[PDB]
């Protein structure tokens, strides 16, 4: 079902790294409801979805809206490790990041979404 899964070899690690960057940089919505609201406001730049979840249907409906908006998403394999990367003290299955158009973080995100677009 979750066929655009992210592969292991440190690709997930650059993902979690940029998640840490954006979580410090406040460009971040956290939790699935925040993801849906961000993508339905269209501010989202990219969204990461856990696959380690009690049933996957949540991170199956979220790709429906990001497919409805044509903005990228990617399946991390670990909800716990994603929550730790965000710094929540709690596991998170869905984290999204928006755009702020004056940085090089945006260059990083451009690279990352190029990676996931080549994954798809």
């Amino acid at each position: 079902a979750a066929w655009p899964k992210a592969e292991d070899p440190a690709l997930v690690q650059e993902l979690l790294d940029c998640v840490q960057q954006a979580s410090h940089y406040r460009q971040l919505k956290k939790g699935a409801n925040e993801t849906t609201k961000s993508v339905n406001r269209g501010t989202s730049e990219l969204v990461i979805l856990a696959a380690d979840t009690q049933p996957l249907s949540i991170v199956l409906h979220i790709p429906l809206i990001c497919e409805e908006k044509n903005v990228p998403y990617v399946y991390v394999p670990s909800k716990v490790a994603l929550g730790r990367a965000c710094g929540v003290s709690r596991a998170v299955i869905a984290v999204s990041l928006t755009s702020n158009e004056a940085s090089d973080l945006n260059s990083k995100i451009r690279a990352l979404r190029d990676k996931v677009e080549r994954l798809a």
Binding site: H24, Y25, R26, A102, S103, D104, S107, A111
Partner: protein
């Protein structure tokens, strides 16, 4: 050169600098860097001078984090510009790291010496930052945001 006029103004306005002196100065820095880039392209590929000197300069730039850790080649060394040098200019980091609401408020903060990098408080807002240091920027202990004394206005209002 009305384009020169409006372009310099947009530089300052996007990063609230003070005069075209400071803007032209940073441009001069960029000019020296792109001079280096031109020379190291003038030597052909796989040359030893080229290899070591270009590897050096790219390490310099990524050490101050201006050129991205993604792109590490002389093409992008040519392709850098003033917006990027201003990005690693300091006051911008206070604004993009969420202590001062505005770039001008950040300028005032740097004046009255409330932020520090590592140990020492900073007074010059054009103190260039490093990639290795840029997250270690916070208020000092002597500033009422960081603590210490509450401040003179709190002092007088308590008076």
């Amino acid at each position: 050169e009305a384009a020169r006029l409006d372009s310099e103004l947009k530089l300052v306005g996007e990063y609230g600098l003070r005069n075209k002196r400071e803007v032209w100065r940073v441009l001069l820095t960029l000019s020296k860097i792109r001079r280096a880039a031109r020379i190291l392209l003038t030597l052909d590929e796989k040359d030893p001078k080229r290899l070591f000197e270009g590897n050096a300069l790219i390490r310099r730039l990524v050490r101050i984090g201006v050129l991205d850790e993604s792109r590490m080649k002389l093409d992008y060394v040519l392709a850098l510009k003033a917006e990027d040098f201003l990005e690693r200019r300091l006051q911008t980091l206070v604004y993009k790291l969420g202590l001062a609401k505005s770039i001008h408020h950040a300028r005032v903060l740097i004046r009255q010496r409330h932020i520090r990098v590592g140990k020492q408080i900073v007074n010059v807002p054009s103190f260039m930052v490093r990639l290795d240091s840029q997250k270690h920027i916070d208020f000092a202990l002597t500033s009422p945001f960081g603590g210490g004394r509450p401040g003179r206005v709190r002092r007088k209002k308590a008076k």
